[PDB]
Structure formats: C-alpha cells, structure tokens
Amino acid sequence: LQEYFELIDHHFELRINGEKLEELLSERAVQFRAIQRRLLARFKDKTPA
C-alpha cells in the first residue's frame, strides 16, 4: 500500500500535466477562431483589404 501510493501520484501528476496541456491549446484556438473571423470580415475582392 505504500508502494501503491507512488503510482497513484505520478499518474495524477500526469493527469495534472494532462490538465496543463489542454488550456493552452483552447485559448490559441480562440486565437485561431478570432483570426478566421478577422479574415472573413476582411476577405473581399476590392482595395482596402
């Protein structure tokens, strides 16, 4: 049960690093959806874009 307690932690820290690599992609996808909406507001076939 002591040796069992080592494996439950580094799995949970890998879940914590699993909970750490997820929020950085989401806001950059929010940055990725904002730049598409900046395109479609701009992308038209004339001069000022």
Binding site: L40, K44, D45
Partner: protein
C-alpha cells in the same frame, strides 16, 4: 418551331420537370443556342428557391422558447442566378462585380444583389453601404426589406423604425411592410404597440395567415379564450389542415368551456403528426386537460408518454414531478426538477419549484442558489421575493 414554343409555354404554366428535359433535347440540335441555354438554366432555378430566413411564426414565445400567462400578458445575369440556389456566393461575386463595372449605372438590381451576397456571407457593413445607394434612386418594396433586415441583425431597433415609416408613406397600406414592423416589436415584447399593427394587416388583407395566429394566440393568453377561438376556426376554413392547428384548436375550446370539439380535435391531432418528437407535444397539452378534470392517474401517463416519445422535453419533467410531490415521493421529485433545470437554463419554473421542496426539508444553501436563478431568469416574481427575504433573515443571524 414547335419544340421551342412548347418549352417556353411549359415555363409559363411552370411545368418545370417537363420543361428541362425537352429544352435539353434541343441542346444537341445546335452547338450553342442562347435561348435554350438560359431556359435550361432558369427552369432549373425555380425547382427550389427560398429567399428569407426561417421565419416560423410563433404565438407563444418571449426568449429561448418560453411560455406565457405566468410571466405576463445580359444572358449572364441569369447565369449569375444559378449560383444563388447553389449558394456559392464568392464565385458569383466576381462576374457580379465584372458586369456592374461593364454598366456602371441603371442597374439597381445588381446593386441590391451584391449587397445580398455580402449579407449572405457576413459582410454586414459592406452590404450596409451597398444597397443604401440603390434605395436613393429607386422605390422598391423588397429593398426596404433589405435595409431593415441587416439593421435588425446589427441590433439597432430604432433604425428599423425609420425605414418602416419612410416606405409606408410611399407605398401606402402595404401588407408585408406592416408585418415587418410588428415583428420587431415582438422581439422586444412591445405588445402594447405590436398588436395594433397586426390589427391593420387584418384590416385590409383579411386572410394573411401569419397575422391571424399571432393575434389568436395573444388573446388565448391574458384571458380571452373565446375570441382566440374565433381566430382559429376561421383559419381552419381557409383549408390548411396541419397537425399543429388541431392542437391549438383543442386548447382554445377547453379553456373557453366548449366541451364538444375540445377532444375530438386532439385525437385528430395525435394522428397526422409528422415526427415522433411532434406527437409528444400533443400528449403534453393533453396532460393539462387531464389536470383540469382532476384525474391524476390519467394525467400521470400523459406527461410520461410525452416523455417516452421525446426525452429532453424540459417542460414535462417539471410538470410530471409536481404530481409526484402530491403523492409523497420527495427524492423522486427532486431529481426530475434537478434534470428539468439542466435541460432549460432559462425558464424560471423548475428553479423556483426546487426551492419549495429543498426549503421544507431545511437545506437553506441549495435552496438559495435554486431561488437565485428564479430571480435572474424571471424578475418581478412575487413568490421569489417572499423567499429570498425569507432566507436572508436566516443567513444574517437568528
């Protein structure tokens, strides 16, 4: 030539599928005939052609489908047109811009169409500068439905008003303008000034269908259930014969106390129902009938059949578990209101009803966040303001 005439005469009586094959039968007789090429085009256009938004005309709605009476109250020009049923907006925009530079005036049609292409994608402001210029040269009824369509989606309810009193005095007594003005008033729930305009689209034009229900619904609520029937028996005699109308005709005869047509109209409404999600709502309104006679055993299996024919019917989960609390099944009831709330994150009625089960037990912490959302989703309620102040005396001290 008799084939060319019979092709064109099929288009006049709009026999479309009989026209396109006979027109392309003339296609191999020539290398290129411009008349058959546009006739094969334009007969293929009018197979399906819709312009406006899904404008499905409610009678009972205020915000995210909430109920009422407990709240309150050249030849290339048509070659361009083949792209507009296919909805390839950008490709059409090139030859649209190519041809308007070929003739840079006397075409308000090409002016308003490119603005329609810009509104079709999302170019709001570029459309808003486009067809304003066409209105300053030409008086056309649909352009008033184009300027005052983009401005409402730009969320300015006072800029919609000026167009709907400008063109109303150049096209006097016009019908679809007078329906467009009373449709934005129901968006802000200005029924003090909405239902007078719908008394004008019924003053002249006494058979417009989508302004007969929206008066005959705003009388069924606020306690005129007899006048609201008169607007629905007349709408039957036009001969539309839906399944949704035999629901509404069933409800008005019961609340007006006319017990003959009140229930045959429901059995015809259970039949001829299109989807399986649609026969739920006719079972659900049958439940409110069954509470009215007093039979609860009948009423318990009316909401249930509405629930097995359609889950996530949020108005029935709440409504079934008031009948449970009448019997005594507290923990059964408090889970149905728990899942009625999570399906409808509006519509105050499970939220307040949670905080009279969870208040009688004594859990004054969940019975606060329950009766918190029964204030934010519907303020000016009476029995929420007699409950938060009932709780906030407990929270300060004894």
């Amino acid at each position: 030539m008799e084939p060319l005439l019979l092709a064109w005469s099929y288009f006049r009586r709009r026999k479309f599928q009989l026209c396109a094959d006979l027109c392309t039968q003339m296609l191999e007789k020539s290398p290129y005939d411009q008349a058959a090429w546009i006739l094969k085009a334009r007969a293929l256009t009018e197979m399906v052609y819709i312009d406006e938004i899904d404008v499905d005309q409610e009678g009972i709605a205020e915000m995210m489908l909430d109920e009422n009476a407990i709240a309150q109250v050249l030849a290339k020009a048509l070659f361009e047109y083949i792209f507009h049923h296919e909805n390839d907006v950008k490709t059409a925009l090139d030859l649209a811009a190519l041809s308007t530079e070929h003739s840079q005036y006397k075409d308000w049609w090409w002016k308003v169409q490119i603005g329609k292409c810009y509104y079709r994608l999302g170019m709001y402001r570029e459309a808003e500068k486009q067809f304003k210029s066409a209105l300053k040269q030409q008086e056309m009824v649909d352009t008033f439905l184009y300027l005052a369509k983009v401005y409402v989606s730009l969320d300015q309810p006072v800029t919609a008003l000026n167009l709907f009193k400008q063109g109303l005095d150049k096209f006097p007594g016009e019908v679809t303008l007078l329906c467009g003005i009373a449709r934005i008033y129901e968006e802000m729930n200005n029924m003090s000034s909405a239902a007078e305009y719908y008394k004008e689209v019924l003053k002249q034009d006494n058979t417009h269908v989508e302004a007969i229900a929206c008066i005959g619904s705003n009388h069924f609520y606020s306690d005129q259930p007899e006048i609201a029937l008169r607007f629905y028996r007349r709408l039957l005699q036009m001969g539309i014969y839906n399944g949704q109308l035999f629901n509404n005709l069933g409800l008005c005869c019961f609340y007006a106390q006319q017990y003959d047509m009140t229930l045959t109209s429901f059995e015809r409404a259970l039949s001829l129902a299109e989807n399986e999600e649609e026969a739920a709502d006719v079972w659900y309104n049958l439940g409110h009938v069954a509470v009215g006679i007093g039979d609860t055993n009948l009423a318990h299996q009316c909401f249930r059949l509405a629930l097995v024919n359609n889950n996530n019917h949020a108005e029935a989960y709440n409504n079934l578990a008031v009948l449970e609390m009448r019997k005594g099944h507290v923990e059964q009831a408090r889970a149905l209101l728990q899942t009625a709330s999570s399906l409808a994150p509006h519509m105050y009625e499970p939220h307040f009803n949670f905080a009279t089960i969870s208040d009688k037990i004594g859990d004054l912490q969940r019975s606060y966040v329950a009766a918190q959302k029964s204030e934010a989703a519907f303020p000016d309620h009476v029995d929420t303001q007699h409950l938060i102040k009932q709780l906030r005396q407990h929270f300060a001290m004894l």
